Every structure is written in structure tokens, then in C-alpha cells.
């Protein structure tokens, strides 16, 4: 008679934080909530195994980009009633509302839980020593490359590591997602997929998509990303920025919360980076400013034996008080627009920078096939990183890889 909820690791002690969050719900409803944490690397497989077997929790977290795929399997309970109780369409950013459903579907299948978007963390101390004005460096693509050139030339050394800092750390290992690449594709005027003629097709091989992708990967090729970074994944690069190896690195808003937590508690409060932390939005590309905007939603399996209490929990987790409290514990942003006004978010100057970048937030379409698109894109992007690791990424070779990515994506989408 326990409600069961599956979550990902959204906070340093993620189960304890989730239990603290729901204790008022448990007391008001006379029920216990049992939480299971799934690592982000394995969550998709465990959630899809529950969807196919009918054995699983009442509720699951879903990354926003997963909602279409899980909804298309016909295993999610409608939640238009819950979203109505929370304020309906009006209560959310369009970028958040669009993740409540499979695109074109009638009925919502997911409740917004938290939002996140990407921006650049930078070392305030390293840019000052390099003579870089952050407002110029993060204005434009030309600004960004000029600032990296100045950071490469800098004699600055981290006070702890006593060594120079990489201008930019970005991972070169085959990525799990396009989160890092997408702003450069978009800033150039391109897109991952495009809807035309009542079908979706790859646009990764568009002149504009190839422009942004080449710009981004050539920064590594030009000496602004150290060879060692190419051999790392996102978690390893995050550790490198925290350990004082990187002047600039792109991530979500949670690293602000982690900068106030001791290392022994899973943050980096003691590190120089934590004490010299800036944030700047992605620079304007040729065709405008964009960043990846995502987050997580909650879904109810239609095979749950506790749908009535599970919907009350969704209403609780989706509502103002729990919205504020969980974003405070995780370092994410509320999903619910009203909750953004809390002074805990507005008066935090680093998080305010994320708040202002949300105007340029861009999302993926909520497609049934999205996983398969992203998986083919990332496997080809990996091959392009391997060329960067040889100094052999040319425009010709990047186009050849993206034409192959585009053939396989169009096959999958058909
Ligand atoms: O693509 C699916 C989905 O992605 C969402 O973005 C997720 C990322 O997928 C995920 O890798 C990222 O994970 C963070 C996590 O939130 C932090 O809590 C975690 O914090 C760590 C800490 O940084 C570590 O030092 C320590 O080891 O433990 C704690 C956690 O216990 O750091 C990781 C690493 O980046 O979280 C992203 C935001 O949820 C998108 O939002 C969504 O749209 C996509 O659908
Ligand atoms: Cl990438
Ligand atoms: Cl896109």
C-alpha cells in the first residue's frame, strides 16, 4: 500500500531530498511514498522495461525529451485533470507545456516537475588575469573565439593546482545527447530535424547546421580544448572544472547549488572555482541566441493500482510550494512559471543569469522517434570528435558524416 516513485539523481542525496519533500503529502494522505533512484545512464532502459512488462512504479520521472517515446507505447495515464488543477496551459512556458504530451496527441501524459537550461560557467579570476571582458567574450561567436585566444595566451595558474587552465572544456567522448552541440547548430540558423510536407526529416546536413557544428568542433581543433578533454565524458569534464582545470564550461543551473555544498557532501564549496564562479549565456550566433532548455516531468503508469493517490501526489509535486522547495534542494528551476518569482531564485545573481537566458531557451520536438534520432546523431558526432582528436575534421568530412547521420535518421523517422 506504499506509493512507489522512480527518480533520477537530481540532488546530492537524491532519495533523502525526495523523502523530505513528500513528508507533508504522506502525513496529509496517511500513506508512505517509496522512492527508487535510477542513474541517468540506465534510467531509460529500466523505464522502458517497466513500460513493456507492466511491472514498475506508480510514478516515474522522465526527462522532457523522453515523454513522446514513452507516451507512444500507450502505457501512460492521462493527466489533463492534474494540469487543470495546477492552472492549465497558462501556468507554464510554452517550452515547458509542449513536453506534457507526445506531439499532436490529444491528451497530456506528463506533469512538469522541474526545468533546466544551459549556459557557460566561467572562472571570474582567470578571465580578469587574461584581460577578457566577459560581456564581449559571450556577446558573439567572434567574441567567444577572441576570448578563448586571450585565455590560451594567459600566464594565469589555478591557486590550488598551480597549473594553467584549459580555455574551454567540452567532452569529446561519444555523447549521450546533443545538449552540448544543439546551441551551435541553432545559433547558425540550423536544426536537428525540420517539419515540412507533413513529415519530419534530418536537417543536421543543412548548410546552417554544418556551419554551427564545424564552428564548435573547430575550437577544439584550434587549441582551445585540450587533447585530454576529447577523451572525457560530461561528468569527467564537470569534475575537471570543479578541480580548477577549465576556465569555461557549459552546464545547467544545478552546479550553482553544488558550489555551496562541501566536497565531502558531493559539492565543491572548498574549491577555487566555487569561490570565483561566473555564469554567462551562450553567445549570439549568426542567426540569433539559443540554448538547450529541458528538465524532467512525472508520469503515471496506466497499470498502477494507486492512480487516485498517485494523481494527488502529481498535483502536490506540480504545485507552488513543492515546486519552490524541490528547486531549492536540486539547484534546478521550477517547472511552474509562478514559482520563478521566489526570491531564492531572483536574488541569486548566478541563477538570475540562467533565468534571463530562458528567453532564448529552445526545446526538441516531442516526437515518438526522438531517442532514435538523437542516438544516430550522437554516434555520428562521436566520429566527428574522433577526427578532431586527429586534427583532421574538415568541412568535407563533417558534411560526409552528417549526410550519413541524415540518411539513417530519415530511414528511422519514415
Ligand atoms: O537526455 C535526458 C534528459 O536529460 C536532462 O538533463 C539531465 C542530464 O541527462 C543528466 O546527465 C544531468 O545529471 C546531473 C544531475 O542532475 C546532478 O544532480 C548531478 O549531480 C551530481 C554531482 O554533480 C556529482 O558531482 C555527484 O557525483 O552526485 C550528484 C548527484 O547525486 O550531476 C549530473 C551530471 O551532469 O542532469 C540533467 C538535468 O536533470 C534534460 O533536462 C532532459 O531534458 C532530458 O530529457
Ligand atoms: Cl558535443
Ligand atoms: Cl531541432
UniProtKB/TrEMBL annotation:
Keywords linked to the UniProt accession: Plasmid, Signal, Transport
InterPro entries attached to this UniProt entry: SBP
Keyword Transport: yes
Short name of any one Pfam family annotated for the protein: SBP_bac_8
A Gene Ontology cellular-component term: ATP-binding cassette (ABC) transporter complex, substrate-binding subunit-containing
Keyword S-adenosyl-L-methionine part of the UniProt annotation: no
GO BP, one annotated term: maltose transport
GO MF entries: maltose binding
Disulfide bonds listed in the record: 169-246
Domain of life per record: Bacteria
Family: Belongs to the bacterial solute-binding protein 1 family.
Protein name: Sugar ABC transporter, periplasmic sugar-binding protein
Amino acid at each position: 500500500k506504499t506509493l512507489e516513485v522512480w527518480i533520477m539523481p537530481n540532488s546530492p542525496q537524491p532519495a533523502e531530498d525526495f523523502k523530505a519533500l513528500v513528508a507533508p503529502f504522506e502525513k496529509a494522505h496517511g500513506v508512505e511514498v517509496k522512492v527508487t533512484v535510477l542513474d541517468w545512464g540506465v534510467a531509460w532502459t529500466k523505464i522502458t522495461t517497466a513500460a513493456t512488462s507492466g511491472v514498475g512504479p506508480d510514478l516515474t520521472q522522465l526527462g522532457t525529451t523522453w515523454v513522446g517515446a514513452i507516451s507512444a507505447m500507450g502505457v501512460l495515464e492521462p493527466v489533463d485533470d492534474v494540469l487543470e488543477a495546477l492552472g492549465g496551459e497558462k501556468a507554464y512556458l510554452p517550452a515547458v507545456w509542449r513536453t506534457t504530451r507526445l506531439e499532436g496527441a490529444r491528451q497530456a501524459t506528463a506533469v512538469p516537475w522541474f526545468s533546466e537550461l544551459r549556459a557557460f560557467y566561467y572562472r571570474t579570476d582567470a578571465l580578469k588575469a587574461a584581460g577578457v571582458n566577459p560581456a564581449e567574450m559571450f556577446a558573439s561567436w567572434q567574441g567567444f573565439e577572441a576570448g578563448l585566444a586571450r585565455l590560451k595566451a594567459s600566464s594565469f595558474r589555478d591557486p590550488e593546482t598551480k597549473a594553467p587552465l584549459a580555455p574551454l572544456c567540452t567532452p569529446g567522448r561519444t555523447p549521450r545527447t546533443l545538449h552540448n552541440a544543439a546551441p551551435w547548430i541553432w545559433g547558425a540558423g540550423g536544426e536537428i530535424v525540420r517539419q515540412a510536407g507533413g513529415r519530419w526529416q534530418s536537417a543536421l546536413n543543412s548548410p546552417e547546421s554544418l556551419e554551427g557544428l564545424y564552428f564548435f568542433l573547430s575550437l577544439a581543433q584550434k587549441g582551445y580544448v585540450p587533447a585530454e578533454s576529447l577523451e572525457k565524458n560530461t561528468a569527467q569534464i564537470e569534475a575537471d572544472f570543479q578541480a580548477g582545470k577549465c576556465a569555461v564550461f557549459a552546464s545547467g543551473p544545478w552546479m550553482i547549488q553544488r558550489a555551496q555544498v562541501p566536497e565531502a557532501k558531493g559539492g565543491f564549496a572548498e574549491r577555487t572555482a566555487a569561490k570565483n564562479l561566473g555564469v554567462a549565456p551562450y553567445p549570439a550566433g549568426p542567426k540569433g541566441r539559443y540554448t538547450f532548455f529541458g528538465g524532467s516531468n512525472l508520469a503515471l503508469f496506466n497499470f498502477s493500482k494507486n492512480k487516485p493517490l498517485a494523481k494527488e501526489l502529481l498535483k502536490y509535486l506540480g504545485g507552488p510550494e513543492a515546486q519552490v522547495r524541490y528547486a531549492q534542494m536540486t539547484g534546478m528551476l521550477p517547472a511552474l512559471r509562478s514559482a520563478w518569482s521566489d526570491p531564492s531564485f531572483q536574488q541569486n545573481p548566478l541563477l538570475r543569469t540562467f533565468i534571463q537566458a530562458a528567453q532564448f531557451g529552445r526545446t526538441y520536438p516531442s516526437l515518438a522517434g526522438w531517442g532514435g534520432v538523437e542516438n544516430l546523431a550522437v554516434q555520428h558526432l562521436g566520429m566527428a570528435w574522433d577526427l578532431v582528436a586527429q586534427g583532421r575534421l574538415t568541412r568535407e568530412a563533417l558534411k560526409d558524416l552528417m549526410d550519413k547521420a541524415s540518411a539513417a535518421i530519415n530511414q528511422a523517422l519514415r
